[PDB]
A paper describes a structure:
The BuVs, along with CuV and TuV belong to the genus Protoparvovirus, which prior the BuV discovery contained only animal (non-human) infecting viruses, and are classified as novel Primate protoparvovirus 1 species. The VP ORF encodes for two overlapping structural proteins, VP1 and [name], sixty copies of which assemble their T = 1 icosahedral capsid in a predicted 1:10 ratio. The [name] monomer extracted from the refined 60-mer capsids of the BuVs contained the core β-strands (βA–βI) and α-helix A (αA) observed in other parvoviruses and large loop insertions between these secondary structure elements. However, unlike the animal protoparvoviruses, the bufavirus capsid contain three separated protrusions surrounding the 3-fold axes, as has been reported for members of the Dependoparvovirus genus, human parvovirus B19, and the HBoVs.
Residue numbers in the entry:
A (entry chain e), B (entry chain a): 33 to 567
C (entry chain b): 277 to 471
D (entry chain b): 521 to 567
E (entry chain b): 33 to 80
């Protein structure tokens, strides 16, 4: 090679139809701007508690949440990951995904890094003028490390998004790799002694069993000078397909129509038939009604939430069941109540350097799923189901207890664009998660992280204050590429009536998506979740 | 490669004669000077109305034209196109084209880009001296994008010429690619309310359906470091040949000579025979005359023009039929009347940096075609064609109505040099253009555009005011090459009398074409249209 | 598909300077470098430039056509009035080719009883729009601005010409006609309106 | 021949016109309904 | 036959995709109610 262009830049998405099946080949390739690696050394330190973490009462137990005291091992490794949807799909493309095909399981993954360019800063000047001269270093080391064995702890999520940029023509900088170590954050709210105020039991770190897995201590690492292309790795997924449709179908809609007389007038308004002929749940003679009838299944489970969960180990929130609040008064622009599982998402540079400057938010409702709705306190548990109406006692209007049971059937909020995560690592645990909230796929193991760092370039004298002045300031750039293969089964119409096709939500409107006169724009949010369906 | 010279510079035109057929192989190769790409981002904005666009009456409806309010999507892509004739033919060569062969259909097209050289500016100095040091970057990315599928909207025309330069030894900079988006410019002249003055109905842009086809979202893009040659693409035209001759033959010349007696004196001056023996158009006994006789065809169609056409969508001009005004008083240097289809052409650097500085103009008449001439108001439509002479009523001297009819046969103004367009894209429409004014060829699709841009090279810190200071100022240079293959059938003499051979027009004279003592010169205009012919 | 693409949108962007402010609002470049239609030195503007084609043709309509053989209407070119004030619920003007359709039993035996109507605009096609009287034909195209005479604001003459390219209003549901019989005639219809 | 997306921005998909609204298409309580009008003409395109 | 059901009623529309090309097979089948034929004879007359 020796400089000859070694690589190709292909950003395209090309569908295939054999009509039983839909194969989706979506390329992506994007520039990357990497510099140091400020300090060459693995470090370990405690982040401070948090911005609003309570210093003193009377905030009492209320504000005990939203504190982020963790201990990390900051390392000089930058990782880049494809888990965002927006990486692989232009919005106009993601339409054709959710319109045509009702489920997709990723199949094959491939990626390659070409071609590296590394250049260094040289400052020359007296201080009346400082002339920075950017000159290539043809001898420079960009060292890339692949994990096919998943030995490294899993840092790859779109939680704290920090993923290679969505906009193909914009150069996207990488996050810095760090992962958690054993800590004890435990705080109490009882306090039982001390009613009503909070204490900090034990902090902040435990050195006895701590695990430091200094990298370069596991995995074969490759060196790349200008003109060579690290490739590839060949990954083959196996995963359960995930349906794109959303179910408006809910409990009390699953079985047959409760018999009734058709109305004579237009329209009715009626009418209902009393004497049936159906099962009932209790000892119930009268009235037999569609409110109580046996059904082989139950959809949705009330959850006691929001639940602040105090573990070692937190405060953290334990998720509930995703459902819309639309059947209730909650809607954008009032009354806004969050009681479902509704997760706001913070973004960067959707309008950046305008500057907003802070921030780009979304908070989907998520409005399309009305089936599974359980508003915990609305439910009521009563002792006797006897057809006789219920007495004063035996009826408890507000109770928050978990209703999840072996009969239930529930759905996550599924793939959502752009900011979703195509996959996440199934934990290794004797019991396994039955369904993963916010992740459409779980894997025994996924394609491992891809690690990249510029190898250090030292000045002659490395001994004193090397971090302050040891090595020559440097930044590299290179193109990253990727290939995905999705399989699908497209949906042919099950309706006579016209569908309501996917489009950006009422909150969004068009001219914000198409670039601004100065070239700033945001991407739409369009789950995905597109098409209603039966059950 | 790694620098070894990878390419060839061949500018030559070599005819072939097998005598039934004339194969013309015309190479071209020319330097290109490209820099940034001022802003990295796709943008969309509204151009202002126009220089002379009416602000207020009493200009009233008169000046409603010559306003250019459009909305474009400026993109950082420069395209280069061969559509000029002058690119492929030296004037002395284009002679042998129009002299020998009467029609030519382009056949095969090929082009290749070698060899790229990219170097960056580095400014070093205190301000008492600023020393710019131009140093190569052997690591730099010139990325070339080809469309064989014509997915991009068609931007390639010599309208707004902006084509790779004509003069082979001069380095020609490229235009910047941008294309129109849905707008509403509609203005009125009636006004009907409001007699005689103009309003602006709706402006300027419509965001509902707007199409943003951000590139790099369709097409495989290639990277070129110094020392590699992007090639090629192989295009094969199929198109209808276009005749080089012009027809002085007009209506009333097509059929046989009206019988007449030869003159005895030298010369006559006569004489005409009254009693014939021929068809007539009306009920016409007397006189039967060559003015009225049936002919299988009609040449030319009067058009109501000039017609300012107000659409969404304009003001624009809808063309008429090309014809000369020479049979009428109109000629260069008086009386100059434009009533035909006569299109002036603005040029650059024919004398540049002299400076004229503005501008080089031409305005062909176009004088050679006398056959199709229709001066709209000259015609008259009368009700009764009875041999009895016409009464006071029934004769309307001035009327502007379109005479185009299924009998007519018309010709464009054909290939014209240098500034013509060898091809233009036939629109995609259920009805298709029958003939294309100013373009000698239409294609189901042509060889697509060739897109080129220097990939950005960022300074270490890209975050603040990147456009103002983000990436290092840069400019590239590379040689562009091309190959055409024309087929032809040469004309052998149909005359006894000596032809009048093609030459530069009386307006032009020789020593302006041959370079000036300081090296400035203009190219001649010589359609092409060269040789008279029958019909 | 429908073509919003119309004349004056087909060729390249008239060169212009990008705006510094957000958003512009500008700006336009005067000195070009392009073809012009007449003898036109100033200003060279995107209003007048040569293009290989023309989209749409003004038609004199509505035209009541009296033949043996009628009264009948001879169609025009289909296009929307949306760029003009015409829209459903005002101002409703029909000046395009816009064909109302009467239906049966969409609500029948209710009874409406009469009738079920539609009248598409048809709004989606903005490209081909020609409102006949809006156009004006002027004699001299000289860069000098036009005099009192030579400018005729309202004229209804047919502009169809060999350069033009036009589209029907295409398949429309349910009431369209998948096919219709091409007539037997020495000249044949180039495009069939409504079929 | 199906169309693959030529755009980055999201299309505006076909639907019944503003004049029409849904519950007239789905049958009435006594079983009367009208069909929608949806050309067809659906997707904008270049030229 | 002699009455045995001789026909099928299939109203369905089934797309096919080979991806260069889309084949659409759309059936239809519908009842029809016909009576006379009030007058047996070809006639010719002028509408008002």
């Amino acid at each position: 090679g020796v400089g000859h262009s070694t690589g190709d830049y292909n950003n395209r998405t090309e569908f295939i139809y054999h009509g039983e099946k839909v194969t989706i080949i979506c390329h992506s390739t994007r520039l990357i701007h990497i510099n140091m690696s400020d300090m060459e050394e693995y470090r370990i330190y405690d982040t401070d508690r948090g911005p609003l973490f309570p210093t003193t009462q009377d905030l009492q137990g209320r504000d005990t949440i939203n504190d982020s005291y963790h201990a990390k091992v900051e390392t000089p490794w930058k990782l880049l990951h494809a888990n965002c949807w927006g990486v692989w799909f232009s919005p106009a493309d993601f339409q054709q995904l959710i319109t045509t095909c009702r489920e997709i399981k990723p199949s094959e993954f491939e990626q390659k890094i070409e071609n590296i360019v590394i250049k260094t800063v040289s400052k020359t000047g007296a201080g009346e003028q400082e002339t920075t001269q950017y000159n290539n270093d043809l001898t420079a080391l960009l060292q890339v490390a692949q994990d096919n064995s998943n030995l490294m702890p899993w840092a790859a999520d779109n939680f704290y998004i920090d993923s290679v940029g969505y906009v193909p023509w914009r150069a996207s900088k990488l996050p810095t790799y760090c992962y958690h170590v054993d800590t004890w954050n435990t705080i109490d709210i009882n306090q039982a002694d001390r009613p009503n105020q909070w204490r900090e039991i034990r902090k902040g770190i435990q050195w006895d069993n701590i695990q430091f897995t200094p990298l370069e201590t596991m995995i074969n690492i490759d060196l790349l000078r200008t003109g060579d292309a690290w490739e590839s790795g060949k990954y083959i997924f196996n995963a359960k397909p995930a349906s794109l449709a959303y179910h408006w179908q809910s409990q009390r809609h699953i079985g047959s129509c409760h018999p009734s007389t058709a109305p004579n007038n237009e329209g009715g308004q009626g009418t209902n038939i009393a004497n049936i002929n159906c099962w009932q749940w209790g000892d119930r003679s009268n009235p037999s009604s569609a409110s109580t009838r046996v059904s082989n299944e139950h959809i949705g489970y009330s959850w006691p939430e929001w639940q602040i969960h105090y573990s070692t180990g937190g405060p953290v929130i334990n998720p509930g069941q995703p459902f819309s609040q639309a059947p209730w008064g909650s809607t954008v622009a009032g009354t806004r109540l969050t009681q479902g599982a509704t997760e706001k998402a913070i973004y960067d540079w959707n309008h950046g350097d305008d500057q907003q400057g802070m921030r780009e938010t979304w908070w989907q409702n998520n409005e399309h799923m009305t089936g599974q709705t359980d508003w915990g306190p609305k439910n009521a548990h009563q002792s006797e189901l006897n057809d006789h109406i219920q007495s004063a006692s035996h009826f408890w209007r507000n109770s928050y207890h978990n209703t999840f049971g072996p009969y239930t059937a529930c759905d996550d909020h599924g793939p959502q664009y752009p900011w979703g995560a195509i996959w996440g690592k199934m934990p290794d645990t004797t019991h396994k998660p039955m369904m993963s909230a916010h992740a459409p796929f779980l894997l025994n193991g996924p394609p491992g992280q891809l690690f990249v760092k510029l190898a250090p370039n030292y000045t002659d004298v490395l001994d004193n204050s090397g971090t302050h002045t040891s090595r020559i300031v440097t930044y590299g750039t290179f193109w990253w590429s990727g290939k995905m293969i999705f399989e699908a089964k497209l949906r042919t119409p099950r309706q006579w009536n016209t569908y309501n096709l996917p489009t950006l939500n009422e909150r969004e409107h068009m001219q914000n998506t198409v670039p601004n006169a100065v070239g700033k724009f945001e991407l739409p949010y369009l789950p995905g979740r597109a098409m209603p369906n039966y059950t």
